[PDB]
């Protein structure tokens, strides 16, 4: 696949954008997960698949019983990995764009994490949309986050939802929801 846009999917805490501590999520959100499954899943054309791109670290992160995520292209990238295809649903590759080679009949690319791919590939050019779940809280500061996001803000726009609609399509896109004491909503950004 040559110049595929990618996008960018993560759930922040504002207004820090907190997204860790200590390898796993800081929070457990029920419908977040959801969303998630839905929108990287789900395709308009029809032998086609969604591919998802991770760090080492987030692949490791999932019960091995749980990987690779079903329904989905898995994209594992290393530094020490050779670009090998592993079988029908696991790539391995040290590089965004070397993996994309490898692919065919993939309908979105979306990169799914972690902190060191999303700091490092938000700069990457083929990155046309930013997927941010907004996640706030009363008190911030008492969730103990170690991994945060560094993004240039500036440089993006966030959109109306209309536009984020048209994005995921069929999904129910519902506002304010809450869960405990975390309220948050689903966001679509593009570059200015
Ligand atoms: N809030 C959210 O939506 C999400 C949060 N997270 C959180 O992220 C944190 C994990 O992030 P982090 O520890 O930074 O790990 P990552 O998942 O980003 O994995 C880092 C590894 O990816 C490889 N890698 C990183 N950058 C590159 C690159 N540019 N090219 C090739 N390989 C690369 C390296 O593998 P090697 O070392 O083998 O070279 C590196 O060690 C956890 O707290 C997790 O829960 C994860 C996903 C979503
Ligand atoms: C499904 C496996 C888990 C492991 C941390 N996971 C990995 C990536 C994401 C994930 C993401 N990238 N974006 C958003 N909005 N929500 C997520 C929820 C869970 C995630």
């Not at 999904?171 to 948050?184: A, Q």
């Amino acid at each position: 696949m040559l110049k595929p846009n990618v996008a960018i999917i993560v759930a922040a805490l504002k207004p820090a954008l907190g997204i860790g501590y200590k390898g796993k999520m800081p929070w457990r959100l029920r419908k977040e997960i959801r969303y998630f499954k839905d929108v990287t899943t789900r395709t308009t054309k029809p032998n086609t698949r969604n591919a998802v791109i991770m760090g080492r670290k987030t692949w490791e992160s999932i019960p091995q019983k749980f990987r690779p995520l079903p329904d989905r292209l898995n994209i594992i990238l290393s530094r020490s990995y050779e670009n090998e295809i592993i079988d029908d649903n696991i790539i391995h590759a040290s590089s965004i764009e070397s993996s994309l080679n490898l692919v065919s009949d993939v309908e979105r690319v979306f990169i799914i994490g972690g902190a060191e791919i999303y700091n490092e590939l938000i700069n990457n050019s083929l990155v046309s949309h930013l997927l941010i779940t907004e996640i706030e809280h009363p008190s911030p500061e008492s969730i103990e986050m170690d991994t945060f996001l560094k993004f240039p803000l500036e440089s993006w726009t966030k959109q109306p939802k209309s536009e984020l609609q048209k994005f995921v399509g069929d999904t129910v896109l519902e506002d304010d929801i809450k869960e405990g004491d975390f309220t948050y909503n689903y966001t679509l950004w593009t570059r200015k």
